[PDB]
Design a protein around this ligand. Structure first.
Ligand SMILES: NC(=O)c1cccc(O)c1O
Ligand SMILES: NC(=O)c1cccc(O)c1O
Ligand SMILES: [Fe+3]
Length: 175
């Protein structure tokens, strides 16, 4: 009957990467950090690293493919990111096609493009408001400085530590 969620922060607390270069953000990113109001640390079966590949289509929206190793198989999900209100911001394509999804926002918070990135996502599904922040790495490992920054930025949006996880590097599928 009931769900309880930490509220999405106001967008004014989410920076946008200045001068965003869509072409340079393309390619494979490993998710080295993951935080959000629906993300929970689980020492029982710790979360395994997955990857997200961004490809710019001719119309400039992105074809985003995520690949995860689950049940001994590689599982692929594709979504389309459509340029939104400002460079570095996106909305989700073919939303009708997702049952219950009424809003989905993507905001690139910061990236140097060839090593790391921090992306904020907010969506409203079945009337519940979810938000998450991904710390992307061009490699599966990042400095402890970047990880700490991600932790501070996640806390600054209301998230406690048990809502921040560092997926464990694997070789299956994401290589
Ligand atoms: N549901 C998923 O498996 C998923 C994977 C990567 C990125 C996302 O936004 C997702 O929702
Ligand atoms: N699973 C989630 O909590 C979530 C939150 C914001 C955006 C997304 O794509 C998500 O998948
Ligand atoms: Fe999602």
């Amino acid at each position: 009957s009931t769900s309880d969620l930490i509220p999405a922060p106001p967008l004014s607390k989410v920076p946008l990467q200045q001068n965003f270069q869509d072409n340079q953000f393309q390619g494979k990113w490993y998710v080295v950090g993951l935080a959000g109001n629906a993300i929970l640390r689980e020492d029982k079966d710790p979360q395994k690293m997955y990857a997200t590949i961004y490809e710019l289509k001719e119309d400039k929206s992105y074809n985003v493919t995520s690949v995860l190793f689950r049940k001994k198989k590689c599982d692929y999900w594709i979504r389309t990111f459509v340029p939104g209100s400002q460079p570095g911001e996106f909305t989700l394509g073919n939303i009708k096609s997702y049952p219950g999804l009424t809003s989905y926002l993507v905001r690139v918070v910061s990236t140097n493009y060839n090593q790391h990135a921090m992306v904020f996502f907010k969506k409203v599904s079945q009337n519940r408001e979810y938000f998450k922040i991904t710390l992307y790495g061009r490699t599966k490992e990042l400095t402890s400085e970047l990880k700490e920054n991600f932790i501070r930025f996640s806390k600054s949006l209301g998230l406690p530590e048990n809502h921040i996880v560092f997926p464990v590097p694997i070789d299956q599928c994401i290589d």
